[PDB]
């Protein structure tokens, strides 16, 4: 019945919030819709895989909050395999390479590729992390899709195709589905293009030993019976002295404050009294989550390494079911595996097939890309379609269609009376990620601590010391990368000398 | 507890569905979330206004289903005032005119305006009403916003500005918010540009005497205690022999079938067991409703008529709070009034003000446009902001952002086990309107009648005889309208 704070949702964000509040001496209850904690993280255990992340998995340098939280819980990381060459597969052929960006030889195409990535970051520098709608050209950029932006920016098909893949992979949505402003914000708030795309020195550097689901599970262990499973919240009443929160099983919870730690659109599953203010009422119908199937194919050995391939494949083209893969082999070198994502419209199209049909299409793709018949001999397969989850709505995260972020964005983490808002979608650094979940949950908890007079306004937003275990190397560019002209820039230089 | 069919939602669609099933001899229950029926229609009664429609109001020729249903319930219509001149207000000046389309005098601008409207209809002819995702260029058109389309199509700022106003008014959304394919479908399925924009011989020809809320109220009267008010549905369970439907007050209802007669995205307010199939699960997070405040300013007399103005104003520009008005005066000539819409981003911006501040801005605008100081002397004001409604989500209707209709559109009216889908959003003719609500409710009810073996598949979709009271005149074009070149077309001839 009665407590200090009810947290709605037992994903990483809700669990981080609850843990902070609990450590501060308050009585907290976590109401979780599912028969498990973790949300968009899920670690499956069986004898064939030992453990496998079917949801969120990767962490890396500059993600100091998730790293600190997991270390406190007794977790360790290991490095994703990137010793050997990466592969860019374009127009039916594989081109091995090293370094984060797929290289290009054609001088015109080189200028176009260089300019695309540079311009993404240039534009991002004008967008405040904590208030993207404050960018000088916020309106113009928000009223365009990423498809429109790419059409104007990319002078070669080669750059446009790679750029399209980048968007599909970053946000599991099509270029025509998403606001240019929101996407530019999304990349900037992860530290930019290099940081977001990189394995070594980027967002995909590491995974947790034993799975990321242990973060939420081990917090649940600390909280004991304060976490209530199979308690979907259906109703929140703020008309009286104490806030009343009701679940689907008719249980009633009374609290001083509430933290909503669920995807913004999933707030629609709750009936509010009094009704939400107009801007939030409409906002929560305007913010879908992307579409992805995470697929892991198991093999007897990590055979790709013997051909000097690390397992990373960047795969261009409509025909390919998977556009991106990473080596998912255990750090011990056993349970050899390739992880791959089926993205956006392909997730919709291929969900029609059976599990066995999808396994076949993936093996046949990998055999082609890796040039290896061994790829046709899987020993096991695991997969998870996140589009089917009632209490997630999609993965990895929420995207904003054109026009929404400038009109409704300021509403996202604005408290509604005694309801405060967490969830990775409300973060200002690595929003969309486990790191953003920790930032948002802890910030929401501190907002309540301030409302109770326990801390000064000063302490609501707190910086995080850099991890000693996962240090960040700075992002650098070369003189040529900074100053080489764009394609239209070269054409004007050509017009100039005609004098 | 037990019945043949539970209908979720007591708007026109739910009520039309329940009425059909009831008349066929089945036991129906209507579960309505609010303390009233009518949904996106709402008729307010008081001494100052007598009655006023604060939600859906207009009906016209080709809307034969709403007209038949209303007539059966004992309702009459009257004609919206369009005797005198309409006004197009552009760049701070009023230009009176006659006929449905605001005219232009510059020759290049004429070609551009003519081509814009014509192209909207040309493109619409390639889009099947019952399956817009089957259009030959479905993907290309769905991957563009209406803003992009207008940028390519409109060679003059004059046409682009009018076209933008058209989009804002039709679907209460910005051009950059909505899919080009969805918008072209939307116009086509109302019968095209002339039919959708016209008062005389179009969608805005008429209103109901006493208000449109009477449609839902009078069906409630027929159904008696079968309508349950303040019963928001929270849970639907389809795992067992009979479907179980639970409300917020913990009441439990058992049925053979369910009709969901609520806006698609409002399906999110219901927890499903088993979970919805993946496509519907995601679809219902991708389909928002538009933004509008409906505002009615009352005056001692319909003073605009004395200046040979009917009360219709088409008002261009960012500064104007209201882009479109109609005469809302009663057929008797009393309760003189102007109805206006505050649309899309302006609804969001101006909601911050007080009621009195909004009234002042509207009166000042109307004084300018009508060229009359009398507009500064209102006797009364009524307004409704539909963006604040938990059980509507907006108005008039659901819009589709780029990419959604092709990927998720086929899911809209696909049954989920024993749940069938009504609501104006599922109609194929005047979807978005009270007419579409009726079509969809009755079609969903007949789907259940077929599933029960009471009617053949043949009878699920049924044509409607033309109203004798509101006959449709055909839409015509002139030889010059059909064959005059576009601006780029003239440039190639040069
Ligand atoms: C799915 C996914 C996510 C993902 C990604 C790949 C996939 C396939 N890869 C990632 C990666 O490699 N690294 C990373 O950092 N992130 C990655 N992502 C995203 C990541 O998993 C998410 O950002 C993060 O897990 C989100 O955490 P958050 O706490 O903000 O949100 P949640 O996990 O969705 O938790 C919400 C919980 O609330 C419950 N819920 C929902 N509705 C209710 C109601 N009505 N009542 C009570 N509880 C409710 C959910 O069940 C969930 O547990
Ligand atoms: C608001 C509006 C609408 C409108 C328009 C101008 C405005 C400001 N002008 C129109 C016009 O001039 N002519 C016309 O034909 N239409 C016009 N529109 C649109 C029109 O009002 C709508 O298309 C029509 O009313 C829609 O009817 P429908 O039956 O399909 O939908 P509804 O009215 O929204 O009814 C839904 C009912 O369901 C209840 N509800 C919602 N959630 C639940 C739950 N969970 N449980 C039980 N009931 C629920 C709603 O309360 C509503 O009553
Ligand atoms: C290497 C290139 C061209 C693109 C990589 C883009 C990217 C963000 C990959 C990471 C995808 C991922 C694991 C998302 C889940 O957080
Ligand atoms: C005549 C012009 C330029 C625009 C009119 C367009 C239009 C659809 C008007 C009707 C608006 C309305 C009452 C919508 C609600 O159904």
Do A116 and A94 share a domain, yes or no?
A: no
Pocket of ligand 1 (CB under 6 A): A 8-14, 31-34, 39-41, 55-58, 232-233, 261-263, 266, 269-270, 292, 294, 386, 391-392, 395-397, 423-424, 432-435, 437
CA distance A216 to A214: 6
At residue B22, what are phi and psi to the nearest 5 degrees? Answer: -60, -45
Q: How far apart are the first and last CA of chain B?
A: 75
Residue A299 Cα distances to A206, A377, A380, angstroms: 21, 7, 7
Q: How far is the CA of A203 from the centre of ligand 3 (A)?
A: 8
Residues B307 and B387 in one domain: yes
Within-domain flag for A488: no
Q: Is residue A335 part of a domain?
A: yes
Nearest to B324 by CA among B196, B237, B448: B196
Site from B138, B402, B405, B411 to mutate, A interface, most A CB atoms within 10 angstroms = B402
Instruction: Give strand pairing partners of B386.
Output: none
Structure tokens at A79: 């490095």
User: Which tokens sit at A345?
Assistant: 């419209």
Ligand 1 midpoint to CA A383 (Å): 17
C-alpha neighbours within 13 Å on the C-beta side of residue B477:
16
Q: What is the CATH number of the domain that holds B257?
A: 3.50.50.60
CB-based contacts of A354, cutoff 8 Å, min separation 6: none
Residues B93, B203: one domain? yes
Largest CA distance in chain B: 75
The Cα–Cα gap between B85 and B373 comes to 19
Q: The tokens of A495 are what? A: 């017009």
Tokens of B154: 């409109």
The 3-state secondary structure of A411-451 reads: HCCCCECCEEECCHHHCCCCCCCHHHHHHHHHHHHHHHHHH
Kindly state the helix (H) or strand (E) to which residue A119 belongs, with its residue range: helix A107-124
Experimentally, the structure was elucidated by X-ray
Q: Which of residues 282-311 of A touch B (CB under 8 A)?
A: 282, 285-289, 291
- Domain membership of residue A361 (yes or no) is yes
Rounded (5°) CA angle B396-B400-B406: 145
Q: Which two tokens stand for residue B142?
A: 């769905």
- Whether B293 and B396 map to the same domain: the answer is yes
B262 touches ligand 2 (CB under 6 Å): yes
Task: Please state the separation of Cα A448 from the chain's center in Å.
Answer: 26
Q: Rounded to an integer, what distance in angstroms lies between the CA atom of residue A452 and that of residue A449?
A: 5
Resolution (A): 1.8
Cβ-nearest to B269 among A268, A286, A403: A268
Are A169 and A146 in contact, with CB atoms under 8 Å apart? no
Q: Give me B227's structure tokens.
A: 């309508």
> Helices A146-153 and A107-124 sit at what angle, rounded to 10 degrees?
140
Q: Can you tell me the distance from the alpha carbon of A12 to that of B136, in angstroms, rounded to the nearest whole number?
A: 45
Please tell me if residue B174 touches chain A, with a CB cutoff of 8 Å.
yes
Q: Is the CB of A120 under 6 A from ligand 3?
A: no
Q: In this structure, which residue's CA is closest to atom 14 in ligand 1? A: A433
Q: Is A451 on the interface with B (CB under 8 A)?
A: no
Is B472 a domain residue?
Answer: no
Of the residues B278, B387, B407, the best mutation for testing chain A's interface (the one with the most A CB atoms within 10 Å of its CB) is B278
In whole angstroms, give the CA distance from residue A90 to residue A95: 8
CA distance A288 to A268: 12
Same domain, B281 and B415: yes
For residue B438, what are its two tokens? 């009726």
**C-alpha atoms less than 13 angstroms from C-alpha of B217 in its C-beta half-sphere:** 12
Q: Convert A292-318 to b/e letters by CB count within 10 Å (16 or more is b).
A: bbbbbbbbeebbbbeeebbbbbbbbee
CA distance A47 to A157: 46
Q: Give Cα separations from B259 to A431, B413, B418, B420 (angstroms).
A: 39, 11, 9, 5
* Cα–Cα nearest to A440, from A473, A474, A385, A397: A397
| B484 belongs to a structural domain | no
Per the listing, tokens 């005469």 go with: B327
Asked if B237 reaches chain A (Cβ–Cβ under 8 Å), the answer is no
For residues B329 and B336, the answer to whether their CB atoms sit within 8 Å is yes
Let me know if residue B483 belongs to a domain: no
Q: Whose CA is nearest to atom 14 of ligand 4?
A: B170
**CB-based contact A402 B145, cutoff 8 Å:** yes
* Angle of the A434-451 helix axis to the A64-72 helix axis, nearest 10: 80
Rounded CA separation A187/A63 (Å): 14
Long-range contacts of A315-320 (CB under 8 A, 24+ apart): A315/A89, A315/A365, A315/A369, A316/A88, A316/A89, A316/A90, A316/A91, A316/A161, A316/A162, A316/A165, A317/A89, A317/A90, A317/A91, A317/A92, A320/A89, A320/A365
Tell whether B350 and B261 lie within a shared domain.
Answer: no
Q: What radius of gyration do chain A's Cα atoms show?
A: 23
Rounded to an integer, what distance in angstroms lies between the CA atom of residue B165 and that of residue B159? 10
Long-range contacts of A462-469 (CB under 8 A, 24+ apart): A464/A64, A464/A65, A464/A68, A465/A64, A465/A68, A466/A64, A467/A61, A467/A64, A467/A67, A467/A68, A467/A71, A469/A67, A469/A71, A469/A77
CA–CA dist A148, A145 (Å, integer): 5
H or E element in which residue B346 lies: helix B345-350
Q: Which of B81, B173, B107, B222 is nearest to B399 (CA)?
A: B173
Q: Is the distance from the beta carbon of residue B423 to the nearest atom of ligand 2 less than 6 Å? A: yes
Measured in angstroms, the CA of A375 and the nearest CA of chain B are apart by: 30
| Cβ–Cβ < 8 Å for A30, A226 | yes
From A139, A170, A197, the end of a domain falls on: A197
Cα torsion angle, A287, B433, A273, B234, sign: negative
**Which residue in this structure is represented by tokens 């086929």?**
B410
B358 and B325, same structural domain?
yes
Residues B356 and B445 in one domain: no
Q: Say whether A401 sits in a helix, a strand or coil.
A: coil
Judged by CB atoms within 8 Å, which residues 368-407 of B form the interface with A? 385, 387-390, 393-394, 401-404, 407
Residue ranges with strand state E in B147-263: 206-208, 227-228, 233-237, 243-247, 252-255, 257-260
- The answer to whether A395 touches A290, Cβ cutoff 8 Å, is yes
Instruction: Output the domain CATH number for residue A331.
Output: 3.90.660.10
B433 CB within 6 A, ligand 2: yes
Q: Are residues A340 and A314 in the same domain?
A: yes
Measured between CB atoms, does A235 come within 8 Å of chain B? yes
B316: Cβ contacts below 8 Å, ≥ 6 apart: B88, B89, B90, B91, B161, B162, B165, B323
Range of the domain at B256: 1-39+61-76+209-287+401-461
Which class for A254: exposed (0-12), middle (13-18), buried (19 or more C-beta within 10 A)? middle
Is A219 in the same domain as A347?
Answer: no
Checking chain B for breaks where C and the next N are over 2.5 Å apart, the residues before them are none
**Domain boundary pick from A173, A197, A221:** A197
How open is the CA angle A17-A20-A24, to the nearest 5 degrees?
A: 140
Q: Quick check: is A478 in a domain?
A: no
Nearest CA-CA partner of A290 in A315, A265, A313, A324: A265
Backbone φ/ψ region at B393: left (φ over 0), alpha (ψ -120 to 50), beta: left
| Residue of B312, B372, B323 whose CA lies nearest to B350 | B323
What would the two tokens of residue B25 be?
A: 């001899």
Q: Are residues A293 and A379 in the same domain?
A: yes
Judge contact between A99 and A152, C-beta under 8 A: no
* Structure token digits, residue B432: 């978005």
Q: Does A167 touch chain B (CB under 8 A)?
A: no
Residue nearest to atom 4 of ligand 2 (CA): B56
Q: Which ligand sits closest to the CA of B314?
A: 4
Per CB-CB distance under 8 Å, the chain A contacts of B177 are: 401-404
The tokens describing A391, both together, are 């209490």
Tell me which residue of B245, B241, B244 sits closest to B231, measured CA to CA.
B245
Q: Is B391 in the pocket of ligand 2 (CB under 6 A)?
A: yes
Assess contact for A282 and A32: CB atoms under 8 A. no
Distance CA B143, CA B127 (A): 15
Task: Of B11, B7, B18, give the one whose Cα is nearest residue B34.
Answer: B11
Last residue of a domain, one of A400, A424, A452: A400
- d(CA A257, CA A350) in angstroms, rounded, equals 43
Residue A489 lies in a domain: no
Tell if the CB–CB gap between A390 and B250 is shorter than 8 Å: no
Ligand positioned closest to the Cα atom of A117: 3
CA distance A400 to chain B (A): 10
Q: What angle do CA A216, A221, A224 make, to 5 degrees?
A: 120
Q: How far is the CA of A41 from the centre of ligand 1 (A)?
A: 6
B152 touches chain A (CB under 8 A): no
Compute the distance between CA of residue B266 and CA of residue B269 in angstroms, rounded to an integer: 6
Domain containing residue A123: CATH number: 1.10.405.10
The dihedrals phi and psi of A338, each to the nearest 5 degrees, come to -110, 125
Residues B407 and B278 placed together within one structural domain of the fold: yes
Q: Number of CB pairs < 8 Å for A and B?
A: 123
* Alpha-carbon separation of residue A423 from A264, A439, B156 (angstroms): 8, 9, 46
Domain count, chain B: 3
Three-class DSSP category at A156: coil
CA distance B112 to A193: 43
Q: Whose CA is nearest to atom 2 of ligand 4?
A: B197
């Amino acid at each position: 019945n009665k407590c200090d704070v009810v947290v709605v949702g037992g994903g990483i964000s809700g669990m981080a919030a609850a843990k902070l509040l609990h450590d501060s001496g308050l009585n907290v209850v976590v109401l979780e819709a599912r028969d498990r904690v973790g949300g968009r993280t899920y670690t499956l255990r069986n004898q064939k895989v030992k453990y496998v992340d079917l949801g969120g998995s990767y962490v890396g340098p500059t993600q100091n909050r998730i790293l600190r939280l997991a270390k406190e819980l007794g977790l360790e990381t290991y490095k994703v395999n990137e010793v050997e060459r990466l592969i860019h597969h374009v127009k039916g052929k594989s081109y091995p390479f090293r370094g984060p960006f797929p290289p290009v030889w054609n001088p015109i195409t080189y200028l176009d590729h260089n300019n695309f990535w540079r311009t993404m970051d240039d534009m991002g520098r004008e967008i405040p992390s904590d208030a993207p709608w404050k960018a000088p050209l916020a309106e113009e950029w928000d009223n365009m899709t990423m498809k429109e932006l790419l059409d104007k920016l990319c002078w070669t098909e080669s750059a446009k195709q790679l750029a399209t893949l980048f968007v599909n992979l970053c946000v599991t949505a099509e270029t025509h589905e998403v606001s240019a402003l929101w996407f530019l914000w999304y990349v900037k708030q992860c530290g930019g293009t290099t940081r977001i795309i990189s394995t070594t020195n980027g967002g995909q550097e590491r995974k947790f030993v034993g799975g990321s689901g242990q973060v939420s599970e081990r917090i649940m262990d600390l909280l004991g019976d304060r976490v209530k499973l199979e308690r979907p919240v259906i109703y929140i009443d703020q008309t009286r002295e104490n806030v009343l929160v009701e679940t689907l099983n008719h249980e009633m919870y009374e609290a001083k404050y509430v933290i909503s730690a669920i995807p913004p659109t999933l707030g629609m599953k709750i009936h509010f009294n009094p009704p939400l203010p107009m801007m939030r009422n409409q906002m929560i119908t305007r913010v879908p989550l992307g579409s992805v199937i995470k697929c892991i194919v198991y093999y007897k050995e990590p055979f790709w390494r013997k051909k000097d391939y690390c397992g990373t494949m960047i795969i261009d083209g409509e025909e390919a079911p998977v556009a991106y893969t990473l080596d998912d082999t255990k750090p011990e070198g056993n349970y050899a595996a390739i992880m791959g994502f089926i993205l956006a419209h392909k997730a919709r199209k291929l969900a029609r097939l059976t599990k066995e049909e999808r396994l076949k299409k993936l093996c046949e793709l990998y055999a082609k890309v890796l040039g290896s018949l061994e790829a046709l001999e899987p020993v096991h397969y695991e997969e998870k379609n996140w589009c089917e989850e009632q209490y997630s709505g999609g993965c990895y995260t929420t995207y904003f269609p054109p026009g929404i972020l400038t009109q409704y964005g300021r509403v996202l983490r604005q408290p509604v009376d005694r309801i405060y808002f967490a969830g990775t979608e409300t973060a200002t650094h690595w929003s969309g990620y486990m790191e953003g979940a920790v930032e948002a949950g802890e910030r929401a908890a501190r907002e309540i601590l301030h409302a109770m007079g326990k801390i000064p306004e000063d302490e609501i937003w707190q910086s995080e010391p850099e991890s000693v275990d996962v240090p960040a190397q700075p992002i650098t560019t070369t003189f040529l990368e900074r100053h080489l002209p764009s394609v239209p820039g070269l054409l004007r230089l050509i017009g100039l000398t005609t004098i």
